[PDB]
């Protein structure tokens, strides 16, 4: 559908921001686990990958339709801890706040596009 193509980029950006938000909050929650590595995703490359499948064929009514079913990069440690935990509070707190801001911005842009498509139709 053409409607999907217009809203594909913002939807994928919003979903990627939510996933990275979950990853950052997991990094915050597991700050005290000894031996836990701080993981993160490269937002731009994954957004390229998602932006850049074959529903199985249903011959009749009984035939069952096809059933549907990111890469994590390690953060470079800054300070060496003794328990092997590489999670840094300041870095991930700033990243968490930034991801929240960008999620809000994506919501704003997507809502503006939908509202414009709506006022085009209203009449």
């Amino acid at each position: 559908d053409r409607l999907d193509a217009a809203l594909r980029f913002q939807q994928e950006a919003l979903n990627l921001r939510a996933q990275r938000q979950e990853i950052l909050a997991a990094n915050i929650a597991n700050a005290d686990t000894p031996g836990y590595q701080a993981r993160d995703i490269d937002f731009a490359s994954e957004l390229k990958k998602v932006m850049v499948g074959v529903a199985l064929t249903l011959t009749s009514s009984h035939h069952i339709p096809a059933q549907a079913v990111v890469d994590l990069l390690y953060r470079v440690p800054d300070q060496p801890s003794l328990d092997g935990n590489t999670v840094d509070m300041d870095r991930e707190r700033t990243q968490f706040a930034d991801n929240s801001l960008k999620y809000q911005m994506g919501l704003t842009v997507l809502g503006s596009q939908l509202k414009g498509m709506m006022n085009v139709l209203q009449g």
């Binding site: 686990t33 000894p34 031996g35 801890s81 328990d83």
Partner: peptide, 16 residues
């Protein structure tokens, strides 16, 4: 398999 957090795992101890 993370271990004890905080004080015990942040003290220099010989490996065993």
């Amino acid at each position: 398999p993370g271990g004890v957090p905080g004080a015990l795992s942040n003290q220099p101890a010989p490996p065993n």
